[PDB]
Design an enzyme around this catalytic site. Structure first.
Site, PDB file in Angstrom:
ATOM      1  N   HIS B  30       0.789  -1.184   0.000  1.00  0.00           N
ATOM      2  CA  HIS B  30       0.000   0.000   0.000  1.00  0.00           C
ATOM      3  C   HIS B  30       0.793   1.190   0.000  1.00  0.00           C
ATOM      4  CE1 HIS B  30       0.217  -0.452   4.490  1.00  0.00           C
ATOM      5  NE2 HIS B  30       1.053   0.498   4.143  1.00  0.00           N
ATOM      6  N   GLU B  54      -0.520  -8.002   0.292  1.00  0.00           N
ATOM      7  CA  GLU B  54      -0.010  -6.836   0.780  1.00  0.00           C
ATOM      8  C   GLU B  54       1.444  -6.629   0.633  1.00  0.00           C
ATOM      9  OE1 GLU B  54      -1.372  -3.517   1.703  1.00  0.00           O
ATOM     10  OE2 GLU B  54      -2.565  -4.952   2.932  1.00  0.00           O
ATOM     11  N   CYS B 139       5.647   1.151   7.798  1.00  0.00           N
ATOM     12  CA  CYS B 139       5.246   0.149   6.839  1.00  0.00           C
ATOM     13  C   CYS B 139       6.230   0.018   5.768  1.00  0.00           C
ATOM     14  CB  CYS B 139       3.924   0.392   6.151  1.00  0.00           C
ATOM     15  SG  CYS B 139       3.149   2.022   5.983  1.00  0.00           S
TER      16      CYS B 139
END
Ligand SMILES: [Hg+2]
Ligand SMILES: [Hg+2]
Ligand SMILES: [Hg+2]
Ligand SMILES: [Hg+2]
Ligand SMILES: [Hg+2]
Ligand SMILES: [Hg+2]
Ligand SMILES: [Hg+2]
Ligand SMILES: [Hg+2]
EC number: 3.6.1.15
Lengths: 173, 173, 173, 173
Positions: B30, B54, B139
């Site tokens: 993402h 992901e 992330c």
């Protein structure tokens, strides 16, 4: 244990179940028997089963267990908290095991899809036969803890990772 | 961890990523896309991109880091084992957070469902306004552990719940 | 974390130490350097050292850290609670590890006798090199933790076992 | 644990004991009954007692339990390992409490100072009124763990910190 609470945990089919009250009750859905019109010797119409996924409550009108106090029983356990899971086994060994509670989520455990509140065992990782981790047959076990004032149940032992490090407990929320 | 291992965690996007080999690069999905054209200064049409959820891997055509050795990228951490989530904070700082890896799952972390290998952090209740957990912007950082004599990779940081403790690692699969 | 809390963890001889207040400072006794003078640029009488055991405080008249609001400085922490170690290292790696805390015996961890309160790290039973464990150089480092929406200091790092499992907290008497 | 391992743990003195083999029997000291010319009915004088602080071993003359087989008694176990205390209640009930092993130590749990291999028990995080941990009469129970495919005994239950998880094992050492 001098037992107001191990012995509210009783055998119930393929699994176990828990008496949160003489009126109330907790157990794991996949564990319930098929075959029947009756449980705790009572007319199956008399009670309010309020089943949810892999959790399943029983709301009784009766002295079922006039020997138990009634227990607080919250939605989930906050993440972080260290609850205990009350396991009885066959030589009826009583095996409380610290469980450090995780997040709520769905998961891929022993192939199945389990929705419940995750958690990790404090006996490190590995189980081989019966002592440090969980078995197939422990479903139904409660996940109690003590708030300020009183005990509370937070859920039922629904499933576990192959190594037994992670467990998922069927809940209310 | 060693210098040469933090050498390979680079900023990328709203986020970060990891040079597993000279030609291989891993990051969280993402953050990457934005709507584009090329990466690490090279043609998208010249990269083999592999998105499993992901997780995302780029395998380039030329060596973009010939300085690197080539790691193994296992396909997820084995449940049980404790990794080190290699965060670089944008402030010159290194915070090599410890985590026990759990089962694959899907939480509902803020506004969206996330899938990947969940895990518990080894710190108190971590997230806090300010505390000792992952903060928004982390992330894509790798999850590495020393198998034997070797350093390896399982996945990247995708997300983490708000009450802290829980995190999710995206994984090749 | 971002360093506001890690900012009170400064270097200190052999080891580390910790700004609890601006007037106040904790550290492990064995780490205090070969006898001198002046510290943190203040001189001995400014300072009233009121060190006792392997715990050592330092009080001064001069607000040396004004940016800092002194924290609650308790003796130990009850049993169970997990506190955070807050290890600042050689590479500027912040490394917060968790410790489910225990009683206050005197163990002998290396070939030295260490009194303080024991604890086990949640990362395990294996800290081989750069791992998920404490190290010789860490002593001094603080154990912290949130009691109410407030941050209490419980102690500093005195010693650890060869395996890293068990660690000792020096406390103020 | 299996039932032939628990047939070993018998009541003794004001606490309990463990049949390591036919000959050898093990218990902590302060439970041994006070004045007496014999036990397990054979005569004191024909028994070889080895007392090692809190720990005490009685080697008998004649197989006093030929029904069982003889196992390994180590010097204590290794740090970090998780063992199980084979705790019998006087009421029938079997409770193998999981514990993680730490440093040798010495603490004053209530009246006096006990030295032995300390440990931390793995059930929520404490014992109370009625619980998940030890009770005063449990002294004497064994601390076993499985090594390859066999079970070994690393020591006996010597005491425990009140309101707490901490536990003390007596050992050969
Ligand atoms: Hg719980
Ligand atoms: Hg639960
Ligand atoms: Hg990993
Ligand atoms: Hg991983
Ligand atoms: Hg503490
Ligand atoms: Hg402490
Ligand atoms: Hg043991
Ligand atoms: Hg032991």
């Amino acid at each position: 244990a001098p037992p107001t609470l191990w012995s509210r945990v009783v055998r119930f089919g393929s699994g176990w179940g828990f008496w949160v009250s003489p009126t109330v009750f907790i157990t794991t859905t996949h564990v319930i028997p098929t075959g029947v019109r009756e449980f705790f010797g009572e007319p199956i119409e008399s009670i309010a089963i309020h089943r949810a996924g892999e959790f399943t409550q029983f709301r009784f009108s009766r002295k079922v267990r006039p020997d138990l106090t009634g227990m607080v029983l919250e939605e989930g356990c906050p993440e972080g908290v260290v609850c205990s899971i009350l396991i009885k086994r066959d030589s009826g060994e009583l095996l409380p095991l610290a469980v450090r509670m995780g997040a709520i989520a769905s998961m891929k455990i022993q192939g199945r899809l389990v929705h419940g509140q995750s958690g990790m065992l404090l006996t490190g990782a590995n189980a081989k036969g019966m002592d440090l981790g969980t078995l197939p047959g422990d479903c139904g076990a409660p996940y109690v803890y003590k708030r300020n004032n009183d005990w509370v149940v937070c859920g039922v032992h629904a499933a576990a990772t192959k190594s037994g490090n992670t467990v998922v407990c069927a809940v209310q929320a």
